[PDB]
């Protein structure tokens, strides 16, 4: 589940930066879904969880704004 979060997160960050926002948006949410799934179920460690928390918020903030205008 962790590898899926990073894999999708990398493609999402590249999609938005490249030009694709629609595909990147759906990818951003996916990365956060898998990331939180691990932290909630069984993360790697204390410091590890803190790393995902900052990342989960980073992508969420980007995707949040993206969908904002996309939906408007």
In the CATH classification, which architecture applies? Answer: Up-down Bundle
Query: Which word captures the global form?
Result: elongated
Indicate how many domains the architecture comprises.
1
Element-by-element helix/strand order: HHH
N-to-C span: 32 Å
Please tally the β strands and state the result. Answer: 0
Assembly classification: monomer
What percent of residues are in strands?
under 5%
**Classification by helices and strands:** mainly alpha
Cα-based radius of gyration, to the nearest Å: 12 Å
Query: What is the fold-level CATH name, i.e. the topology?
Result: Methane Monooxygenase Hydroxylase, Chain G, domain 1
What's the CATH C level? Answer: Mainly Alpha
Largest sheet: none
Helix content: over 70%
CATH superfamily heading: Phosphotransferase system, lactose/cellobiose-type IIA subunit
Annotation field: number of helices: 3
Folded structure, characterized:
The protein is mostly helical and 72 residues long. It has a single domain, classed as Phosphotransferase system, lactose/cellobiose-type IIA subunit (Methane Monooxygenase Hydroxylase, Chain G, domain 1, Up-down Bundle), CATH 1.20.58.80. It contains 3 helices and no strands. The chain has helices spanning 2-18, 22-42, 46-71. Helix 1 runs antiparallel to helix 2 (22-42) and helix 2 packs antiparallel against helix 3 (46-71). The protein is elongated. The chain starts with a helix and ends with a helix.
């Amino acid at each position: 589940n962790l590898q899926k979060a990073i894999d999708l997160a990398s493609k999402a960050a590249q999609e938005d930066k490249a030009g694709n926002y629609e595909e990147a948006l759906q990818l951003y949410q996916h990365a956060v879904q898998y990331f939180l799934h691990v932290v909630k179920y069984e993360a790697q460690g204390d410091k590890a969880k803190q790393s995902i928390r900052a990342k989960c918020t980073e992508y969420l903030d980007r995707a949040e704004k993206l969908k904002e205008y996309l939906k408007n």
